[PDB]
Ligand binder design. Structure first.
Ligand code: HEM
Ligand SMILES: OC[C@H]1O[C@H](O[C@H]2O[C@H](CO)[C@@H](O)[C@H](O)[C@H]2O)[C@H](O)[C@@H](O)[C@@H]1O
Length: 153
């Protein structure tokens, strides 16, 4: 359980992300696809992308990034009370997309890497710790839902 102080550190850096959610989304998904190429194979719509240039030029991938970060932002703003938001997300990711917790760990790493790079003024050690705590909570809760839905994850 995160403290209010930790939630504020999370929301404070997220406020910066929101200045340009599309740009942050591109950086994050590109970082993920490059650090862990296997994750790209889960996207029938994007698995053909060969280079960072192509990824950057993809309007659909940009849209996907906005969709993803907006959903994550809504979850973070709930400050742990995200039961309603997690239900549909866990169902689609467990049953349709089949995204292992391991891949959620990979994207969590990508998110932290990008925020660390773009926002040193709001992502010091304490802030990163708070974000990690928030993302671990997210994955923990997603894992529990995966279990209920019959997915090993
Ligand atoms: C912070 C974690 C993540 C969030 C909040 C998130 C959110 C979303 C949302 C809101 C959608 C659209 C609605 C839906 O289908 O549920 C989506 C679609 C999808 N997500 Fe995730 N996602 C996350 C991580 C991942 C990861 C790590 C992968 C893959 C390695 C992944 C793969 C997919 C796929 C395959 C789709 C469908 C893309 C398409 O429309 O072609 N997601 N995700
Ligand atoms: O922070 C690095 C560790 O990250 C992962 O573990 C955290 O998140 C898991 C959820 O994805 C939890 O089950 C685990 O309890 C958390 O510590 C990763 O699995 C670990 O190997 C890393 O050391």
């Amino acid at each position: 359980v995160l403290s209010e102080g930790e939630w504020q550190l999370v929301l404070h850096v997220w406020a910066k992300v929101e200045a340009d959610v599309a740009g942050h989304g591109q950086d994050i998904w590109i970082r993920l696809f490059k650090s862990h190429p296997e994750t790209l194979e889960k996207f029938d719509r994007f698995k053909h992308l060969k280079t960072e240039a192509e990824m950057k030029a993809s309007e659909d991938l940009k849209k996907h990034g906005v969709t993803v970060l907006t959903a994550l932002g809504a979850i973070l703003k709930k400050k742990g009370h995200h039961e309603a938001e997690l239900k549909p997300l866990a169902q689609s990711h467990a049953t349709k997309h089949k995204i292992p917790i391991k891949y959620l760990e990979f994207i969590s790493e990508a998110i932290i890497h990008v925020l660390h790079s773009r926002h040193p003024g709001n992502f010091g050690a304490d802030a990163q710790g708070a974000m990690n705590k928030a993302l671990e909570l997210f994955r923990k809760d997603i894992a529990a839902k995966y279990k209920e839905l019959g997915y090993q994850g």
